[PDB]
């Protein structure tokens, strides 16, 4: 009955806790005590993409590390050119309440989400020379927060109703649904192998699904507030979660434990975005104290600041070859750094 | 110049820059409003009184002023995650039902808690809040039998309509601590078109205040 189920749950949680305690032998600093530091990192802005008219909520790099998409609540979703601060497209949206955007790895399609349950998919290679809506996906009952393509034919979305779903664009239906979270989901990051992914919930947890069977694999609950952004390590065996309580974590799959926490006393704001670098040594983050922060990923030491933004940053991405990094804040400007 | 066939892309860039500029100018002339409330707060009566899943964006015009009422209560999640999308709105329509002699905790206690929460938020320091008091006839009818002390132990005085209404209005209005934003109050009960002109007057007053503050004259 209820007592038996409670006892089983308590026994399972105690066994998991004991196994996790036993598996831990030493911290990561001891193994990385002989690792050379990186030193001060002086990065200056190279381009300032002054095109928007409101606060920017999302951006996503292209596939050839040149084209760029920015989505903002001014009502537009315009595709940029990073090498020459040039504009190539301007897509007027239906609902100006936009919190996410995506770029297909083939470059053919883009997808925008929003606060109206609908993840509309656009087309860029029409024969009439204009961008035009192809299909609208509407199966959620909350608000979408992140959408990442799998290929040109299927997409993955996460909405503020404790559900994450996979869609087949050819038909327009919802193929598989994911469930198990208790609060809103606000982040999603597809793995490099495109076989499984992670999703951080608002109830201070993160779970690992696979796109083949639809069942949760692991969960990592050691973190004290809602999670706002996740991204994998380039190896595809780790990911960093950025919450609102001034700290960001770094988890590992096979170790099945938290590895490191990155914080300082003076930091009191909350993370907003997380990315990495091509070699997986530099951790970037986006803070509410009106700036950015370059974080050493192996020493947990504050190792540079990308200050210069006038307001809170809300999006942060790096190119596919680690050549540049772009940031967009609640002021209409984007920036490029090297 | 060094540009070859790149001169044909700069023309496209400038064309769409002009398009964005004109679109922003045309879309900056509509006053945006937000509507809050609670369960059985009478906000349906006023949203259906305006005659032309997700956010039900209502649109209408009055005295050549483009209005946008972003009714959002339909969301089902933790609220605090998406209000900051609605920053830089011109005002907030807040509806309170004057039938606070019931429990769901006491309803007026819940309304006071919600108003205190949404009135001292970091985003709405300078955002004026329009306060509507609804169902005045029901409250006046009910106050004949039951007094106001059935819900407010601190209250002292008579059991008449005008004084009780003034006390309730003062209790709601004294909840703001910032000295920049102002609270506008009104009382209606399924009445005539008056529900829209009060909103228009409040919007004009807020725009005037914003212009004075922006010009630096304030």
């Amino acid at each position: 009955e209820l007592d038996q189920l409670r006892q089983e749950a308590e026994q399972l949680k105690n066994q998991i806790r004991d196994a996790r305690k036993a598996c831990a032998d030493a911290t990561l600093s001891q193994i990385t005590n002989n690792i050379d530091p990186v030193g001060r990192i002086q990065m200056r802005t190279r381009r300032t993409l002054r095109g928007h008219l409101a606060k920017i909520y999302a951006m996503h790099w292209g596939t050839d590390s040149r084209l760029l998409v920015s989505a903002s609540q001014d009502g537009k979703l315009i595709i940029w050119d990073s090498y020459t601060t040039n504009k190539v497209h301007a897509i007027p949206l239906r609902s100006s309440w936009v919190m996410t955007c995506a770029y297909a790895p083939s470059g053919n399609y883009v997808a925008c989400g929003g606060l109206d349950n609908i993840c509309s998919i656009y087309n860029l290679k029409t024969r009439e020379g204009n961008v035009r809506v192809s299909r609208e996906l509407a199966g959620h009952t909350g608000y979408l927060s992140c959408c990442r393509f799998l290929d040109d034919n299927q997409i993955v979305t996460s909405s503020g109703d404790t559900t994450c779903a996979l869609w087949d664009i050819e038909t327009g239906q919802q193929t598989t649904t994911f469930t198990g979270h208790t609060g809103d989901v606000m982040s999603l990051s597809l793995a490099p192998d495109t076989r499984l992914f992670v999703s951080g919930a608002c109830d201070a947890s993160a779970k690992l699904w696979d796109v083949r069977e639809g069942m949760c694999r692991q969960t990592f609950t050691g973190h004290e507030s809602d999670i706002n952004a996740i991204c994998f390590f380039p190896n595809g065996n780790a990911f960093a979660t950025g919450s609102d309580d001034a700290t960001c974590r770094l988890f590992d799959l096979r170790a099945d434990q938290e590895l490191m926490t990155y914080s300082h006393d003076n930091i009191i704001c909350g993370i907003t975005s997380v990315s990495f670098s091509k070699s997986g040594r530099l951790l970037l983050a986006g803070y509410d104290d009106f700036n950015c922060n370059v974080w050493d990923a192996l020493k947990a030491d504050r190792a540079g600041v990308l200050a210069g933004h006038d307001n809170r940053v809300s999006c942060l991405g790096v190119t596919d070859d680690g050549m540049a990094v772009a940031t967009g804040s609640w002021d209409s400007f984007l920036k490029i750094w090297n | 110049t060094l540009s070859a066939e790149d001169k044909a892309a700069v023309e496209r860039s400038k064309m769409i820059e002009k398009n964005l500029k004109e679109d922003g100018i045309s879309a900056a002339k509509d006053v945006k409003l937000l509507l809050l409330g609670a369960g059985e707060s009478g906000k349906s009566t006023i949203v259906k009184q305006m005659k032309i899943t997700g956010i039900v964006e209502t649109h209408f015009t009055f005295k050549n002023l483009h209005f946008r009422l972003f009714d959002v209560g339909g969301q089902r999640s933790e609220r605090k995650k998406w209000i900051h999308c609605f920053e830089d709105v011109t005002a907030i329509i807040f509806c309170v039902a004057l039938s606070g002699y019931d429990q769901v905790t006491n309803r007026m206690h819940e309304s006071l808690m919600l108003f205190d929460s949404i009135c001292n938020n970091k985003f709405f320091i300078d955002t004026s809040i329009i306060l509507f008091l609804n169902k005045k006839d029901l409250f006046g009818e009910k106050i004949k039998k039951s007094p106001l002390t059935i819900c407010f132990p601190e209250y002292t005085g008579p059991n008449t309509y005008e004084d009780a209404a003034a006390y309730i209005q003062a209790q709601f209005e004294s909840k703001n601590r910032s000295p920049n934003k102002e609270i506008y109050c009104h009382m209606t009960c399924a009445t005539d078109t008056n529900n829209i002109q009060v909103v228009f007057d409040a919007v004009t007053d807020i725009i005037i205040a914003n212009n004075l503050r922006g010009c630096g004259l304030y």
Partner: single-chain antibody
Amino acid sequence: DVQLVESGGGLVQPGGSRKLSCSASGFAFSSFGMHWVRQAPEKGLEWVAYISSGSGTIYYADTVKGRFTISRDDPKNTLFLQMTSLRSEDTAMYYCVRSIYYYGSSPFDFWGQGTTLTVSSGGSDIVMTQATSSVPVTPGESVSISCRSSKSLLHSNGNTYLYWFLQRPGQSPQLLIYRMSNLASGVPDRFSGSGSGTAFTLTISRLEAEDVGVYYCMQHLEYPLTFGAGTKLELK
């Protein structure tokens, strides 16, 4: 569907004037750029005019500037070209093409039909030359073509501006390769492009019987735009 069709041809007395209209339908006309490419009865192609989107910049040929004018009315998706004081060397049919320009776009992706125009009798620009205008080929083998220019086409941007074409007998020309390396849309995965600086080649493998015609080469570095004499390919 995308459709281009031109009307206004016929005959006109020497020194006369006439109008020609390139009526288009099936695409966003107001966001494109239009050209005019005339063709002599036996010679190759010559570029005549140009007008960009919004009619911002207009270019002209060297034997045409001062006589003809080109204008478009995109609310009614129709192109215009006013020709005055005609000459006996203008007895050529005119064409009409599609020239969208942005990063990664493919210009000259469509070609009009062509309107006849007969009139009764009475140095610093880039020059591009081709090897021979008559080369017989056989099915089942791989053939190559060349078109050498006079000025290096590898711009400092890293791009090279050269466009290969194909003209089937009695029909409109088609786009095969743009920027000397990319393959256009709809054209099969059979053809291929190559070259470096001034010596360009186009490679065809497993040749069929549908690829007979004349191949033309074009530059797009700086205006005016110059073509080649072409190369005729015939069966057996």
